[PDB]
Amino acid sequence: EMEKEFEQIDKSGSWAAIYQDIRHEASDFPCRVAKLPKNKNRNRYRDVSPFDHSRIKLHQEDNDYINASLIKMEEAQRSYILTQGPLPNTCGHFWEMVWEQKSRGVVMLNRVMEKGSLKCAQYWPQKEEKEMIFEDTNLKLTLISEDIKTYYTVRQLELENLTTQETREILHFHYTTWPDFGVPESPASFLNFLFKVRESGSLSPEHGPVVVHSSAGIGRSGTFCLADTCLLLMDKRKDPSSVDIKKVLLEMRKFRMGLIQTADQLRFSYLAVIEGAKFIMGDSSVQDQWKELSHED
């Protein structure tokens, strides 16, 4: 049992060590296009870029670069598009990609201003009377509703392709209490937030990939996707004892760098998967218990 390895690891204080090892055994594919002089301003951090083999391309003959890389999971059968927090100049590309990839859900695991620093652009309207019009990519985004909770908030945006005058409802999940280089207040708060997103049909195969992100799109985003993916496997296999987190993390770092950035984030990913397993393993009554513990009211 993973719960074995976990109590074993914690006991010996091996989280930082193991983490050094995951870092050490981690893939490294080139990021040529990111580093192109021209794309310099299409990137928030000079040290976080998309492997060109997994990068997502804007369907424009102009410049198809967007710091974002499609993670495609085969066994779990799930794809996610982790991307960094759009910059002032790139919120058009962010919605262009969302439209092209056919997503139906966005997951923001960060705050626009954290510990007094700008981490991500206010890429979506906050008031229904003020829509946004992305000139460069010809899109209109508008707030339709907003369901504010304790530590998170869902929104229903309406993305309209000013070109085909086609419209789509983008649900938006926003975690607002996951600190930069931090962990969720609790496995409960996290899994509660996770399941909400699940139920909304956003993670549904019938749509494009969910666009997940934080300020850089590797730390809190890797932690969200890892827990979701492991649980996914545990379900299908129905044999939980076979899911190796380190292996699944490593499999994901093939598609995009730095997934998960702190030993404690790794450790947390174990708690989330273990806790949540309980719900996969019939204990349906656990789902509601999480909502209670999350204090999402």
Binding site: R44, Y45, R46, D47, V48, S215, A216, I218, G258, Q261
Partner: peptide, 4 residues
């Protein structure tokens, strides 16, 4: 500019 640098995150890591």
């Amino acid at each position: 500019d640098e995150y890591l």
